[PDB]
Design a binder for this molecule. Structure first.
Ligand SMILES: [Mg+2]
Ligand SMILES: [Mg+2]
Ligand SMILES: [Mg+2]
Ligand SMILES: [Mg+2]
Ligand SMILES: [Mg+2]
Ligand SMILES: [Mg+2]
Ligand SMILES: [Mg+2]
Ligand SMILES: [Mg+2]
Ligand SMILES: [Mg+2]
Ligand SMILES: [Mg+2]
Ligand SMILES: [Mg+2]
Ligand SMILES: [Mg+2]
Ligand SMILES: [Mg+2]
Ligand SMILES: [Mg+2]
Ligand SMILES: [Mg+2]
Ligand SMILES: [Mg+2]
Ligand SMILES: [Mg+2]
Ligand SMILES: [Mg+2]
Ligand SMILES: [Mg+2]
Ligand SMILES: [Mg+2]
Ligand SMILES: [Zn+2]
Ligand SMILES: [Zn+2]
Lengths: 118, 38, 51, 40, 43, 162, 59, 38, 222
RNA sequence: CGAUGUUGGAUCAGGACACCCAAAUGGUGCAACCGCUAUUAAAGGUUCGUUUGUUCAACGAUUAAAGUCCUACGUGAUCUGAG
RNA sequence: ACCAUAGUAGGCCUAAAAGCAGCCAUCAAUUGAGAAAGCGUUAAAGCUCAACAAAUUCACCAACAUAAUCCCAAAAACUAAU
C-alpha cells in the first residue's frame, strides 16, 4: 500500500560544506522563504494537493513569501519535491509605507526597495 | 497484474529505470594512470 | 612538438586585439558615425521598435 | 532561450519580467505630455 | 516482423524503451534542486 | 636492425646476419619521467587511425605487428595501437607496408572500396537482413571500443555503433 | 520534383551544358586523411621518434 | 564439427582459433574434437 | 630455477564420522494436511539466516532467490558424494528438508473452485544463503572446481566460495559503496523521498537499497 | 450473437526452415556400398490405389522424395454435402 | 620450449594387480624425480605431468539458432553542449 512517506531527521542535518555550497549563513538562519511551484499536482497524492492549496501555490511559477517557522517547514518538507525555495534577501532593508508602490522582486532572491527612480 | 516476485525479471517502471540509471555506480578515476607512472 | 589528429583542437585559434587598441578603434568608429549623423548623409532609416 | 545566463546576471528568466522593455511606457504623445498608464 | 505482444506498455513483455542522457540530466537537475530545498528547510 | 642474407654458390648455402644503423629516440621528450613511450611523449588519448606517422614507427615492413616486450608500451596502449594499425590497413593507409608479389599484381580484381574506421574484417561479417525494428535494432559497429577514452574537444561521446 | 533537379555522376565526366551552369563548389564535409607515402619528408623528420628499436632485433 | 555454445578442449593437442568471426577448437590427433562456437 | 614456498598444513582439522551428505526425504515424516498460501517474502530480500560459516571452510553461496526441491537435493547429494574425498573432506547441509507445500491443479480445470492438491514440497532460499558447507584438510581449488558444476546446476545463480572469498567480496562491496563518486545514491533518495519517488518504489525498497528486485540480486548496484 | 457460414476433399496455391530429395562439406564405433549424426542452402518437386465422410490410420506398387508448419488449423459472393 | 635415471614388482587378496579393480604404509639415491597427478596393457611395455639444469610480455571466471505477404525513416565515431 502506498501511503505518506516518513522523512528521517538525518536528512535535514546540514553539513559544514553545505553552507558554503549554497551560500548560506552558518550562524544566523534566514528569516523568510520565497517558494515557487515548479511541477504540477496531477499524478500526485491528494494530501500533497491539499498542502499545495493551503500554501497558496495554485499558480505555478509565481513566488510566494512564507515564514521560516517549523509549522510551515513541515508542509514544505512534505511537498519539497514540487517547489524551489530561496531565502529572502533585503539589501536595502524592509520597505516602509512610502516605498510600497516602488518595490520589486529580482529573480536572484532579493527585494529591492527603490525600483525605477524617475 | 503480476506478482511481486516473478521469473521474467519484472520489467520496471520508467521512473524506476531512470532512478537506477542515475544511481548507477561510478568508480573513482585518477587523473594519471599509475601503471606507467614512476 | 608532436602533431596528431587530436593533439590540437579542431578549430582555428582566435586572437583578440588589445583592450586599449579596441577602445581607440571603437572611439574612432563612433566618432565617424556621429560625423555621418551630423552631416546627414543617411537617406532612409529603419527601426525595430517594441510596442 | 538563454535563461540561465539571465538568471546568473540577475535579470528575469523571461525578458518580459520587470525589465525596461515592459516597465517603461511604450508610447507617449508627440507634445511630450505623459500617456495614460497601462492596465498590466 | 518484430511484434510486441499484448499492448505496448501493459503486458508482461513490454517495449524495451531505454533511458536517455537527457532524462538522466533532467533527473540530476531535479535532484540538485530538491537537495538545495531540503538544505534550506534544515535551520 | 638485423637482416638475414643467404648466398648460393655451387651447392653451398651461406646464411649470415648483418646489422644496419637504426634511428634513435628524439633527445627531448616532454615527460621524461614516464616509463611508457607513449605515456611519456604525452600521446596517450591523442592518437587515432588517422595519425599514420605514429603507427608506422613500430610495425614490420610487411604490415605485421611488433612484440610488446620489444616495444615497451603499456598493455592498453599496445592493444589500442594494434587496433589502430588494423583499422588503417583495412582503410588503405600504409600502402608501402604490403608484401611485394610480382605474380599477383598483374591479375587485377574489383576496385578496392573506400572505407575507414572499420572494426571487423571485411571477409567475416554477414549482411544484416533483418536490421531490427526501432526498439530492438541491430546497430552497425563503427570504430574500436578501445578508443572511447580519447580527448573530445566538442565533448560529445563517440558513437561506436551506428 | 527536387530529385529531378539532382545530377549524379560516377566520375569527373560532366557534360559542358552542366559544367557551364556551376556557380560554386561546396566544401567536403569530411577531411580526407593522408597516406603514409603522401606525407612530406620534412614533416616525417619533424615528427619525433617515440621509441628506439634495439639493434639486435630483426624485422 | 560439433556446434556448441561453450568450447572446451578434450585433449592437450586441441587449439582454439578465431576464424570467420567464430571460435573453433581444432584437433589433429582426434578429428572428432572439432568444435565450433555458435 | 624457481623459489620454493611453504605449503599450508592442516593439523587442527578433524574429519567427523559420516563425512558424506545425509539422505533427505522428498516428503517429511509428518505431511502438512492444511494447505498454505505461497508466500513470496521467503524469497524476496536478502537472507537473514545461514549467512555465515559454522564449521566448514568452503560453501555454496547463492546470489539469488529460489526454491530447492527433492530433485535438486538428490543432484547435489549424489554429485558431492561421488566427487568428494571421505578421508580428507566432509560436507554439511545449510538448508532444511523441503517443507513448504506446493499445490497443483490437473489440466482442464477452469479457474477457481478452491485450492489445488499438494504436489511436492520445496525449500525457499534467499540470496546470500549458503546451501552446502564443506571442510577438511584440502585446498580451495579442487573444491571450487567440483562445486562450480553444482552451483551452475542450481536454479538460482551460485558460486563456490570460501571464508577468504566471502570476506574479499564483502570488503570490495563496502569499498565500492564508500568510494562511489556520484553524490546521488538509491538509499539516500529512497530515504529522503526525493522527486516523490516513493510513489513508484516499494516499502521493501527502503531496506533493499536498490540491490534486490524480486528474487534477483545484483551485487554491482552498490 | 441488427450473423466472423462451421470438417474433409476438387482447383489455385503464397510463405517460413526446425530440409525428404536434389548441392557443397565435417566427425564417425567411416576399409568400399548401405549407414548414424553435424553445418549451409528454399530457384524446383514431393505419386498412384483399397477400406473409412474422414484429418489421421493400416495395407499394395513405385519413386530421388511421398517433409513439418502458418496462411479465418488458406481458399463455399469458385465447387462439392458424406459427417 | 626443457628433459626424464635408482632400491622397487613397497607390502596383502586375485590367473595377473609392475604408479594405476581394491586396502595399508607413502620411506629413501643423485643438486635435481610423487611407492605416482593423467592416457594405455589381460598383466606389462610404452606416451604425458610436476624436480633440476634455459628463460623468464600478460594470462581466475566470463562468448548461446530459429516462422511463416516485404528488411524497415535515411543517415552520421569530433568546430567547442548545464
Ligand atoms: Mg498488482
Ligand atoms: Mg498488439
Ligand atoms: Mg503487452
Ligand atoms: Mg543456474
Ligand atoms: Mg457472433
Ligand atoms: Mg454487423
Ligand atoms: Mg453490419
Ligand atoms: Mg507453394
Ligand atoms: Mg538451415
Ligand atoms: Mg541430400
Ligand atoms: Mg517449396
Ligand atoms: Mg486451432
Ligand atoms: Mg478453413
Ligand atoms: Mg470448406
Ligand atoms: Mg455458392
Ligand atoms: Mg470466400
Ligand atoms: Mg447429408
Ligand atoms: Mg634425492
Ligand atoms: Mg616437466
Ligand atoms: Mg539450427
Ligand atoms: Zn603506458
Ligand atoms: Zn583433441
Amino acid at each position: 500500500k502506498f501511503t505518506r512517506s516518513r522523512i528521517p531527521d538525518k536528512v535535514f542535518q546540514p553539513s559544514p560544506e553545505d553552507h558554503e555550497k549554497y551560500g548560506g549563513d552558518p550562524q544566523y538562519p534566514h528569516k523568510l522563504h520565497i517558494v515557487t511551484r515548479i511541477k504540477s499536482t496531477k499524478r500526485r497524492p491528494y494530501w500533497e494537493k491539499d498542502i499545495i492549496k493551503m500554501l497558496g501555490l495554485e499558480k505555478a511559477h509565481t513566488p510566494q513569501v512564507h515564514k521560516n517557522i517549523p509549522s510551515v517547514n513541515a508542509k514544505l518538507k512534505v511537498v519539497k519535491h514540487l517547489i524551489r525555495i530561496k531565502p529572502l534577501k533585503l539589501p536595502q532593508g524592509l520597505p516602509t509605507e512610502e516605498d510600497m508602490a516602488n518595490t520589486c522582486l529580482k529573480s536572484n532572491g532579493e527585494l529591492v526597495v527603490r525600483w525605477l527612480l524617475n | 497484474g503480476s506478482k511481486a516476485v516473478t521469473r521474467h525479471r519484472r520489467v520496471m517502471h520508467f521512473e524506476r529505470q531512470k532512478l537506477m540509471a542515475v544511481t548507477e555506480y561510478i568508480p573513482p578515476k585518477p587523473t594519471i594512470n599509475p601503471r606507467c607512472l614512476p | 612538438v608532436p602533431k596528431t589528429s587530436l593533439g590540437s583542437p579542431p578549430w582555428p585559434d582566435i586572437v583578440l586585439p588589445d583592450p586599449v587598441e579596441e577602445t581607440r578603434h571603437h572611439a574612432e568608429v563612433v566618432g565617424q558615425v556621429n560625423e555621418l549623423i551630423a552631416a546627414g548623409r543617411y537617406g532612409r532609416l529603419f527601426a525595430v521598435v517594441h510596442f | 532561450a538563454g535563461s540561465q545566463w539571465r538568471l546568473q546576471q540577475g535579470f528575469a528568466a523571461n525578458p518580459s519580467g520587470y525589465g525596461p522593455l515592459t516597465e517603461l511606457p511604450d508610447w507617449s504623445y508627440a507634445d511630450g505630455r505623459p500617456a495614460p498608464p497601462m492596465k498590466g | 516482423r518484430n511484434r510486441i505482444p499484448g499492448r505496448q506498455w501493459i503486458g508482461k513483455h513490454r517495449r524495451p524503451r531505454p533511458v536517455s542522457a537527457q532524462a538522466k540530466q533532467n533527473m540530476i537537475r531535479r535532484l540538485e534542486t530538491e537537495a538545495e530545498n531540503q538544505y534550506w528547510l534544515s535551520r | 636492425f638485423r637482416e638475414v642474407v643467404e648466398i648460393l654458390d655451387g651447392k653451398t648455402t651461406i646464411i649470415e646476419g648483418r646489422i644496419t644503423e637504426t634511428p634513435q629516440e628524439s633527445p627531448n621528450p616532454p615527460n621524461p619521467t614516464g616509463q611508457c613511450p607513449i605515456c611519456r611523449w604525452n600521446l596517450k588519448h591523442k592518437y587515432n587511425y588517422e595519425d599514420v606517422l605514429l603507427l608506422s614507427q613500430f610495425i614490420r615492413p610487411h604490415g605485421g605487428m611488433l612484440p610488446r616486450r620489444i616495444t615497451g608500451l603499456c598493455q592498453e596502449e599496445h592493444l589500442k595501437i594494434e587496433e589502430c594499425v588494423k583499422m588503417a590497413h583495412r582503410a588503405g593507409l600504409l600502402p608501402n607496408h604490403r608484401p611485394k608479389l610480382p605474380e599477383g599484381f598483374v591479375p587485377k580484381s574489383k576496385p578496392r572500396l573506400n572505407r575507414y574506421l572499420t572494426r571487423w574484417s571485411p571477409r567475416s561479417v554477414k549482411p544484416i537482413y533483418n536490421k531490427g525494428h526501432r526498439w530492438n535494432k541491430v546497430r552497425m559497429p563503427v570504430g574500436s571500443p578501445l578508443l572511447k577514452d580519447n580527448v573530445s574537444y566538442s565533448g560529445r561521446p563517440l558513437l561506436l555503433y551506428h | 520534383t527536387m530529385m529531378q533537379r539532382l545530377h549524379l555522376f560516377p566520375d569527373e565526366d560532366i557534360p559542358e551544358d552542366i559544367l557551364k551552369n556551376l556557380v560554386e563548389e561546396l566544401p567536403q564535409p569530411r577531411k580526407v586523411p593522408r597516406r603514409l607515402d603522401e606525407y612530406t619528408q620534412e614533416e616525417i623528420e619533424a615528427f619525433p621518434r617515440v621509441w628506439s628499436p634495439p639493434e639486435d632485433y630483426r624485422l | 564439427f560439433k556446434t556448441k555454445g561453450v568450447l572446451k578442449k578434450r585433449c592437450r593437442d586441441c587449439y582454439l582459433v578465431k576464424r570467420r568471426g567464430r571460435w573453433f577448437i581444432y584437433c589433429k590427433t582426434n578429428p572428432k574434437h572439432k568444435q565450433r562456437q555458435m | 630455477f624457481k623459489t620454493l614456498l611453504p605449503v599450508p598444513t592442516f593439523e587442527d582439522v578433524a574429519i567427523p564420522e559420516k563425512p558424506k551428505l545425509r539422505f533427505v526425504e522428498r516428503v517429511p515424516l509428518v505431511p502438512k494436511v492444511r494447505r498454505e498460501r505461497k508466500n513470496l517474502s521467503d524469497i524476496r530480500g536478502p537472507s537473514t539466516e545461514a549467512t555465515e560459516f559454522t564449521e566448514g571452510r568452503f560453501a555454496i553461496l547463492a546470489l539469488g532467490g529460489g526454491y530447492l526441491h527433492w530433485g535438486h537435493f538428490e543432484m547435489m547429494r549424489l554429485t558431492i558424494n561421488r566427487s568428494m574425498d571421505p578421508k580428507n573432506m566432509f560436507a554439511l547441509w545449510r538448508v532444511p528438508a523441503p517443507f513448504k507445500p506446493i499445490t497443483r491443479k490437473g489440466m482442464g480445470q477452469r479457474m477457481g473452485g478452491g485450492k489445488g492438491a499438494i504436489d511436492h514440497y520445496v525449500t525457499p532460499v534467499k540470496a546470500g544463503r549458503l546451501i552446502v558447507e564443506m571442510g577438511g584438510r584440502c585446498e580451495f581449488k579442487e573444491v571450487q572446481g567440483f562445486l562450480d558444476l553444482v552451483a551452475h546446476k542450481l536454479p538460482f545463480p551460485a558460486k563456490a566460495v570460501s571464508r577468504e572469498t566471502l570476506e574479499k567480496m564483502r570488503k570490495d562491496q563496502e569499498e565500492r559503496e564508500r568510494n562511489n563518486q556520484n553524490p546521488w545514491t538509491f538509499e539516500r533518495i529512497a530515504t529522503a523521498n526525493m522527486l516523490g519517488i516513493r510513489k513508484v518504489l516499494s516499502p521493501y525498497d527502503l531496506t533493499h537499497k536498490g540491490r534486490y528486485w524480486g528474487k534477483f540480486y545484483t551485487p554491482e548496484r552498490v
